[PDB]
RNA sequence: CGACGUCGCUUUUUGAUCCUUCGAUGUCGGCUCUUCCUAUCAUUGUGAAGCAGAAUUCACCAAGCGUUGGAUUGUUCACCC
RNA sequence: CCAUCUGUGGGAUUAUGACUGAACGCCUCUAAGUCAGAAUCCCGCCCAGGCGGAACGAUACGGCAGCGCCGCGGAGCCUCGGUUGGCCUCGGAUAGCCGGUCCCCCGCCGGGACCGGGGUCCGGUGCGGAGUGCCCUUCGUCCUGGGAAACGGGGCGCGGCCGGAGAGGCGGCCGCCCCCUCGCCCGUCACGCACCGGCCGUUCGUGGGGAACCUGGCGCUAAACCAUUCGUAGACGACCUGCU
């Protein structure tokens, strides 16, 4: 037969690999289009969700009904302690998409982000980068990183600086950091390169990075909510209360 | 049939001579068949075709061809022909323009086959005649008397299979 | 000193669509490649070469890990210059498209 | 070594056939500038039909469903894959000897590509019929890399064009050198047109 | 554009066909694929070849929509083709080419070494060359 | 049929220059140099001539639907022709009703503003095309002057401006207001 | 729009037939859910009209997205607010 | 939706309307060559991330061990594919290739002087010889003579000047230092009847690929899982966590 009514379909086909998040921090798949039109500027930033709050202000829609008068709305706190850099990569473009080109990591990292590369701190010698901390302190080293930044200056095309968040002042259970690029929109890649470079192992505060009254986008790993059923997954009606093995 | 390179046939041939009188006439008919059966064969189509007269009462009294007159002059040719087209008989003159008479119906039957698709069992020639640029008739033809013509060789290709499948450059298409 | 065999690529079989005949492989000669060049081969010597685990004996030498399935050239087969040979054993139809030396032992020049 | 076809110029089909002769007979063929290949047909007949092949999926599955290709590179490889046997060991095995590539890697860069005459579209295409673009097909039914795989390409053309350059003015020292000492080559200058050389 | 012609006077060399290798006159066009051709004192009869199996050179004679053969030998030997054609390079090269294919094994012996030895003169001179463009240079 | 040749000849102004690398065809003369690459024609161009009198379109071989383009080839290089030595331009009268037209040019050689359109509020900013100089003219009340030297272009952005202001859902046969091409031109006349 | 004529299509009707299962395919309708088709009711873009505007009718590209809440019968079907 | 917030940008065109323009001296949206064009179509944004890839860190004190980097030495296993190389311009087809200037100006002291590439000239070729029917390498050990040679040749010689990015292999030259001036073509003594008595797998890529074992120099001193905790996650696994 033909489906005797038409109602919309139910859930969104367009969400279906729908599963846990093998990420467990907001992965950006994207970043808005590099221009030179700008000098540089940082375009992502980490924060911690912490509940929402109220708010009163009066709106200002010109020729709306509720023009010129006040309303409430519920905004979410995130807080945010400024993030130190501690890290860039460079990016080539091949015809297969993009080539993670080189990195350089700073020549000390604290141990928020040493944290980041163990599991059992206490099982471990946490001995990372202390080889590669001489490749600040030799000068064969420091002409090594000329050749690496020259090379990232004329070949790649695309410039992300690791950045990460600092547990030790925040309140949270958890003291490993969290670790993120940030793509850095601007003038030219020298300038981006450069400038970066100058940029490196220093607080990176928020109000630099983002506007005020701006626009942005959140990207989260959502609540969780176990094994569930299939009334309230793909929200679909419950037979009549009077079925057999199941309603 | 099943043409190959029709070659120009004459026969002649007549009905038995019964009692009642000593010998009828003789008939000469000029056919195009790729071998002397054949144009056996076809004789005694056009002949009960005609006049009513079977081989199984008649014999055929001369087979063979005609080689051709001058076959190192070239002569375009007025062929008086008449098919059948899947909705009735229709008459027709074509032309064509060669050497050999035999060359000159051999085109005309290709090129009926494909330009008009009509096979080679239903095409019967009555006419094949040598004229003249002052009878000669369709542009196609008509535009092969000039006591000087030029055209150049426009797109030229040719075979690079057997010259290797694989080679390192590339063909010139102009001379 | 150099190489004194023609290369040749094992190719396949005479076989008809369905029906595959082992008792007839087909070669093609590296350098012909058309008929009407074949009648130089024709009746050509020409041996499979391999290796494998257990080692054999070589005549004239020591024990060396090669062998050899022997044959020769029957017919020309094709426009395009395949030809047919017959070998000694049935060809182990691992090696289609593997290569073969076709000799220059019977030389009828 | 192994074989390497330039793709510009070429018809589709009159190229998948001989790579796909080749390789089965053991030719290891590579492919390069896959993207300039021709079609025979104007533009929007084969657009056409690549969306009806695009549709051809199922309800959602890839599973159930063909993995199309939208690369330049793999649509030609598809279409060899369809001129070879895809479900026995040799066919297998012949499919992977051979490699598609966009534009063109470094390492055949500095190498020798041949053509294959019998599939050129100047030979095999008349003159006043419709041709359309691999390269055009793919980035209209998605192929994210056409800037980028003409710009580098682009890019080894000037890298390259001082190669050529070199070339030229070895050649013309070769000819002044010859010039300039045949007075002691003439008995080795005799020998070479006597049997039948450099003439 | 183009610049060599078929006229009543062509004169072409076979590339295809049973007598491959020969140069022939065109006499005069039978249609677009097919003209009479012959050469007389290139031993050929005259006989209709396609255009497929011609090719094309640059020497044209005088003769009308039809003629005797007895009048286009005058014709051929007023311009004397047979030097003219055997001057022009394009005969040089098939003529050097079947030497080449006819070149027989101790001839092939002896080329190796003969260009062997001028190869290494070649490199010789071409390196002293190389010395001396530097210098000179920039 | 394959007619064996066709043939077409213009007899060029000496007081214009012409050149040539194959199918491309330059023409350069007093109010500047046109180019026009014909790929795809398949034609033999000559040009032949003391102070190159004569310019010749060879087609060879060709069928009917294939001469059809050598007269076609011909039609082109002489309006480029008469764009090179005098100039093309056209005029457009704005017909209204009850909502005059106001159109005027927003920015000097391009980009004409259009509004009051049978009371629209929607402005047009028609992006004339490149090398057209639109010109509002004033000794008539109502009156588009486009210029150029490619016929192609100017008529193209003639059409153009000319359709980007209709109406819809609207009688076309009692509804007329908008602008028109109506008077095509040259620059200078004989 | 279309009579007297005539050529097709579709298998969303009803027939005609017995090929497949009688050591079994669970056979009406409704409820829930996916998806598909187009010969399009509405919407995006269009031509036409006996089209001034407003409505409305014919036709084109087109299935991406909609196509309801109830009284009466088991109802498919129907009917009505 | 019983309260609250958020839900997006391009390309190619179809219907359709047109530009120029023949076919057919006119006419023409079309036949060559163009434009505008949309809940369609394709991609972008958003979901997952391939017997698919990238960059980077750390890489085992029983120093009384496990290992890595170099230069070889030493066997034994087993896998089995070939049997000189080619280092490279775009591209055009009813056209090209190549030379040099008289000439045009343009970036690297251009413009104030050396410097090619870019144009425009004119010349040789074209069924392409500056041609893949192509080019280079290319053939048992030994005394002496002619010709090139000495601006040479060789050095896992030092080093340098430097370079190479779509998957860095690899590249030249040069300061030197050392060693021969012989090795290449044409001739002159010869030398192990080379050894096979007519006869097959030997004739190089080879120092090839991978596991497992006994030599000298220089360097490394780790992590993972469990157990445990946490609850931002949980059917059990898995995940996020803390632990001198």
Same mark, same amino acid.
């Given at each position: 037969?033909?489906?005797?009514?038409?109602?919309?379909?139910?859930?969104?086909?367009?969400?279906?690999?729908?599963?846990?998040?093998?990420?467990?921090?907001?992965?950006?798949?994207?970043?808005?289009?590099?221009?030179?039109?700008?000098?540089?500027?940082?375009?992502?930033?980490?924060?911690?969700?912490?509940?929402?709050?109220?708010?009163?202000?009066?709106?200002?829609?010109?020729?709306?009904?509720?023009?010129?008068?006040?309303?409430?709305?519920?905004?979410?706190?995130?807080?945010?302690?400024?993030?130190?850099?501690?890290?860039?990569?460079?990016?080539?473009?091949?015809?297969?998409?993009?080539?993670?080109?080189?990195?350089?990591?700073?020549?000390?990292?604290?141990?928020?982000?040493?944290?980041?590369?163990?599991?059992?701190?206490?099982?471990?010698?946490?001995?990372?980068?202390?080889?590669?901390?001489?490749?600040?302190?030799?000068?064969?080293?420091?002409?090594?990183?000329?050749?690496?930044?020259?090379?990232?200056?004329?070949?790649?095309?695309?410039?992300?600086?690791?950045?990460?968040?600092?547990?030790?002042?925040?309140?949270?259970?958890?003291?490993?950091?969290?670790?993120?690029?940030?793509?850095?929109?601007?003038?030219?890649?020298?300038?981006?390169?450069?400038?970066?470079?100058?940029?490196?192992?220093?607080?990176?505060?928020?109000?630099?990075?983002?506007?005020?009254?701006?626009?942005?986008?959140?990207?989260?790993?959502?609540?969780?909510?176990?094994?569930?059923?299939?009334?309230?997954?793909?929200?679909?009606?419950?037979?009549?209360?009077?079925?057999?093995?199941?309603? | 049939?099943?043409?190959?390179?029709?070659?120009?046939?004459?026969?002649?041939?007549?009905?038995?001579?019964?009692?009642?009188?000593?010998?009828?006439?003789?008939?000469?008919?000029?056919?195009?068949?790729?071998?002397?059966?054949?144009?056996?064969?076809?004789?005694?189509?056009?002949?009960?075709?005609?006049?009513?007269?079977?081989?199984?009462?008649?014999?055929?009294?001369?087979?063979?061809?005609?080689?051709?007159?001058?076959?190192?002059?070239?002569?375009?040719?007025?062929?008086?022909?008449?098919?059948?087209?899947?909705?009735?008989?229709?008459?027709?003159?074509?032309?064509?323009?060669?050497?050999?008479?035999?060359?000159?119906?051999?085109?005309?039957?290709?090129?009926?086959?494909?330009?008009?698709?009509?096979?080679?069992?239903?095409?019967?020639?009555?006419?094949?005649?040598?004229?003249?640029?002052?009878?000669?008739?369709?542009?196609?033809?008509?535009?092969?008397?000039?006591?000087?013509?030029?055209?150049?060789?426009?797109?030229?290709?040719?075979?690079?299979?057997?010259?290797?499948?694989?080679?390192?450059?590339?063909?010139?298409?102009?001379? | 000193?150099?190489?004194?065999?023609?290369?040749?690529?094992?190719?396949?079989?005479?076989?008809?669509?369905?029906?595959?005949?082992?008792?007839?492989?087909?070669?093609?000669?590296?350098?012909?490649?058309?008929?009407?060049?074949?009648?130089?081969?024709?009746?050509?010597?020409?041996?499979?070469?391999?290796?494998?685990?257990?080692?054999?004996?070589?005549?004239?030498?020591?024990?060396?890990?090669?062998?050899?399935?022997?044959?020769?050239?029957? !017919?020309?087969?094709?426009?395009?210059?395949?030809?047919?040979?017959?070998? !000694?054993?049935?060809?182990?139809?691992?090696?289609?498209?593997? !290569?073969?030396?076709?000799?220059?032992?019977?030389?009828?020049? | 070594?192994?074989?390497?076809?330039?793709?510009?110029?070429?018809? =589709?089909?009159?190229?998948?056939?001989?790579?796909?002769?080749?390789?089965?007979?053991? *030719?290891?063929?590579?492919?390069?500038?896959?993207?300039?290949?021709?079609?025979?047909?104007?533009?929007?007949?084969?657009?056409?039909?690549? =969306?009806?092949?695009?549709?051809?999926?199922?309800?959602?599955?890839?599973?159930?469903?063909?993995?199309?290709?939208?690369?330049?590179?793999?649509?030609?490889?598809?279409?060899?894959?369809?001129?070879?046997?895809?479900?026995?060991?040799?066919?297998?095995?012949?499919?992977?000897?051979?490699?598609?590539?966009?534009?063109?890697?470094?390492?055949?860069?500095?190498?020798?590509?041949?053509?294959?005459?019998?599939?050129?579209?100047?030979?095999?295409?008349?003159?006043?019929?419709?041709?359309?673009?691999?390269?055009?097909?793919?980035?209209?039914?998605?192929?994210?890399?056409?800037?980028?795989?003409?710009?580098?390409?682009?890019?080894?053309?000037?890298?390259?064009?001082?190669?050529? *350059?070199?070339?030229?003015?070895?050649? *013309?020292?070769?000819?002044?050198?010859?010039?300039?000492?045949?007075?002691?080559?003439?008995?080795?200058?005799?020998?070479?047109?006597?049997?039948?050389?450099?003439? | 554009?183009?610049?060599?012609?078929?006229?009543?006077?062509?004169?072409?060399?076979?590339?295809?066909?049973?007598?491959?290798?020969?140069?022939?006159?065109?006499?005069?066009?039978?249609?677009?694929?097919?003209?009479?051709?012959?050469?007389?004192?290139?031993?050929?009869?005259?006989?209709?070849?396609?255009?497929?199996?011609?090719?094309?050179?640059?020497?044209?004679?005088?003769?009308?929509?039809?003629?005797?053969?007895?009048?286009?030998?005058?014709?051929?030997?007023?311009?004397?083709?047979?030097?003219?054609?055997?001057?022009?390079?394009?005969?040089?090269?098939?003529?050097?080419?079947?030497?080449?294919?006819?070149?027989?094994?101790?001839?092939?012996?002896?080329?190796?070494?003969?260009?062997?030895?001028?190869?290494?003169?070649?490199?010789?001179?071409?390196?002293?060359?190389?010395?001396?463009?530097?210098?000179?240079?920039? | 049929?394959?007619?064996?040749?066709?043939?077409?000849?213009?007899?060029?102004?000496?007081?214009?220059?012409?050149?040539?690398?194959?199918?491309?065809?330059?023409?350069?003369?007093?109010?500047?140099?046109?180019?026009?690459?014909?790929?795809?024609?398949?034609?033999?161009?000559?040009?032949?001539?003391?102070?190159?009198?004569?310019?010749?379109?060879?087609?060879?071989?060709?069928?009917?639907?294939?001469?059809?383009?050598?007269?076609?080839?011909?039609?082109?290089?002489?309006?480029?022709?008469?764009?090179?030595?005098?100039?093309?331009?056209?005029?457009?009268?704005?017909?209204?009703?009850?909502?005059?037209?106001?159109?005027?040019?927003?920015?000097?050689?391009?980009?004409?503003?259009?509004?009051?359109?049978?009371?629209?509020?929607?402005?047009?900013?028609?992006?004339?095309?490149?090398?057209?100089?639109?010109?509002?003219?004033?000794?008539?009340?109502?009156?588009?002057?486009?210029?150029?030297?490619?016929?192609?272009?100017?008529?193209?952005?003639?059409?153009?401006?000319?359709?980007?202001?209709?109406?819809?859902?609207?009688?076309?046969?009692?509804?007329?207001?908008?602008?028109?091409?109506?008077?095509?031109?040259?620059?200078?006349?004989?």
């Amino acid at each position: 037969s033909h489906r005797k009514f038409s109602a919309p379909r139910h859930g969104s086909l367009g969400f279906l690999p729908r599963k846990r998040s093998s990420r467990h921090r907001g992965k950006v798949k994207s970043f808005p289009k590099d221009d030179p039109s700008k000098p540089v500027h940082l375009t992502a930033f980490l924060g911690y969700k912490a509940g929402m709050t109220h708010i009163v202000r009066e709106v200002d829609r010109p020729g709306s009904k509720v023009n010129k008068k006040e309303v409430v709305e519920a905004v979410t706190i995130v807080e945010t302690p400024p993030m130190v850099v501690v890290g860039i990569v460079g990016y080539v473009e091949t015809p297969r998409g993009l080539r993670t080109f080189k990195t350089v990591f700073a020549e000390h990292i604290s141990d928020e982000c040493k944290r980041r590369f163990y599991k059992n701190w206490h099982k471990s010698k946490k001995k990372a980068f202390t080889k590669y901390c001489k490749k600040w302190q030799d000068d064969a080293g420091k002409r090594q990183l000329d050749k690496d930044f020259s090379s990232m200056k004329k070949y790649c095309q695309v410039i992300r600086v690791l950045a990460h968040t600092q547990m030790r002042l925040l309140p949270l259970r958890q003291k490993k950091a969290h670790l993120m690029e940030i793509q850095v929109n601007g003038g030219t890649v020298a300038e981006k390169l450069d400038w970066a470079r100058e940029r490196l192992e220093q607080q990176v505060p928020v109000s630099q990075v983002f506007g005020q009254d701006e626009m942005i986008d959140v990207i989260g790993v959502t609540k969780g909510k176990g094994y569930k059923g299939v009334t309230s997954r793909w929200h679909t009606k419950k037979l009549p209360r009077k079925t057999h093995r199941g309603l | 049939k099943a043409s190959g390179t029709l070659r120009e046939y004459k026969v002649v041939g007549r009905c038995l001579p019964t009692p009642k009188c000593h010998t009828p006439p003789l008939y000469r008919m000029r056919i195009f068949a790729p071998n002397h059966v054949v144009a056996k064969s076809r004789f005694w189509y056009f002949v009960s075709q005609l006049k009513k007269m079977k081989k199984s009462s008649g014999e055929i009294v001369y087979c063979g061809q005609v080689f051709e007159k001058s076959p190192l002059r070239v002569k375009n040719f007025g062929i008086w022909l008449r098919y059948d087209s899947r909705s009735g008989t229709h008459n027709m003159y074509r032309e064509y323009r060669d050497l050999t008479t035999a060359g000159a119906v051999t085109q005309c039957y290709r090129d009926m086959g494909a330009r008009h698709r009509a096979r080679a069992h239903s095409i019967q020639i009555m006419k094949v005649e040598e004229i003249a640029a002052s009878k000669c008739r369709r542009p196609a033809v008509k535009q092969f008397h000039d006591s000087k013509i030029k055209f150049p060789l426009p797109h030229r290709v040719l075979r690079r299979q057997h010259k290797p499948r694989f080679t390192t450059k590339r063909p010139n298409t102009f001379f | 000193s150099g190489r004194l065999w023609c290369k040749a690529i094992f190719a396949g079989y005479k076989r008809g669509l369905r029906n595959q005949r082992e008792h007839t492989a087909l070669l093609k000669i590296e350098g012909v490649y058309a008929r009407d060049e074949t009648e130089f081969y024709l009746g050509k010597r020409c041996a499979y070469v391999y290796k494998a685990k257990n080692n054999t004996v070589t005549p004239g030498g020591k024990p060396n890990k090669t062998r050899v399935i022997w044959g020769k050239v029957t !017919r020309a087969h094709g426009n395009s210059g395949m030809v047919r040979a017959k070998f !000694r054993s049935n060809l182990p139809a691992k090696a289609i498209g593997h !290569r073969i030396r076709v000799m220059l032992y019977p030389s009828r020049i | 070594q192994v074989l390497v076809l330039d793709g510009r110029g070429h018809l =589709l089909g009159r190229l998948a056939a001989i790579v796909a002769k080749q390789v089965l007979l053991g *030719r290891k063929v590579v492919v390069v500038r896959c993207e300039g290949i021709n079609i025979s047909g104007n533009f929007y007949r084969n657009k056409l039909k690549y =969306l009806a092949f695009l549709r051809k999926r199922m309800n959602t599955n890839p599973s159930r469903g063909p993995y199309h290709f939208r690369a330049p590179s793999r649509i030609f490889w598809r279409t060899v894959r369809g001129m070879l046997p895809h479900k026995t060991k040799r066919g297998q095995a012949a499919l992977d000897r051979l490699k598609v590539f966009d534009g063109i890697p470094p390492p055949y860069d500095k190498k020798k590509r041949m053509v294959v005459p019998a599939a050129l579209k100047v030979v095999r295409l008349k003159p006043t019929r419709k041709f359309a673009y691999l390269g055009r097909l793919a980035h209209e039914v998605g192929w994210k890399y056409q800037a980028v795989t003409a710009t580098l390409e682009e890019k080894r053309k000037e890298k390259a064009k001082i190669h050529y *350059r070199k070339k030229k003015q070895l050649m *013309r020292l070769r000819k002044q050198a010859e010039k300039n000492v045949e007075k002691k080559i003439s008995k080795f200058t005799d020998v070479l047109k006597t049997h039948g050389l450099l003439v | 554009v183009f610049r060599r012609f078929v006229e009543v006077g062509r004169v072409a060399y076979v590339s295809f066909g049973p007598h491959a290798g020969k140069l022939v006159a065109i006499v005069d066009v039978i249609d677009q694929n097919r003209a009479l051709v012959d050469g007389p004192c290139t031993r050929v009869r005259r006989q209709a070849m396609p255009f497929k199996c011609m090719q094309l050179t640059d020497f044209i004679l005088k003769f009308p929509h039809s003629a005797r053969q007895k009048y286009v030998r005058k014709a051929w030997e007023k311009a004397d083709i047979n030097t003219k054609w055997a001057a022009t390079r394009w005969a040089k090269k098939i003529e050097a080419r079947e030497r080449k294919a006819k070149m027989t094994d101790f001839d092939r012996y002896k080329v190796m070494k003969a260009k062997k030895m001028r190869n290494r003169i070649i490199k010789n001179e071409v390196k002293k060359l190389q010395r001396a463009a530097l210098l000179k240079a920039s | 049929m394959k007619t064996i040749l066709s043939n077409q000849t213009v007899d060029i102004p000496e007081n214009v220059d012409i050149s040539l690398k194959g199918r491309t065809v330059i023409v350069k003369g007093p109010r500047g140099t046109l180019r026009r690459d014909f790929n795809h024609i398949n034609v033999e161009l000559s040009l032949l001539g003391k102070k190159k009198k004569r310019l010749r379109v060879d087609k060879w071989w060709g069928n009917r639907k294939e001469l059809a383009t050598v007269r076609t080839i011909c039609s082109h290089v002489q309006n480029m022709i008469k764009g090179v030595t005098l100039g093309f331009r056209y005029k457009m009268r704005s017909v209204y009703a009850h909502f005059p037209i106001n159109v005027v040019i927003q920015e000097n050689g391009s980009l004409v503003e259009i509004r009051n359109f049978l009371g629209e509020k929607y402005i047009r900013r028609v992006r004339m095309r490149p090398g057209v100089a639109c010109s509002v003219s004033q000794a008539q009340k109502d009156e588009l002057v486009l210029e150029g030297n490619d016929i192609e272009l100017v008529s193209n952005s003639a059409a153009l401006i000319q359709q980007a202001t209709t109406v819809k859902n609207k009688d076309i046969r009692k509804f007329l207001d908008g602008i028109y091409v109506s008077e095509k031109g040259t620059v200078q006349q004989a």
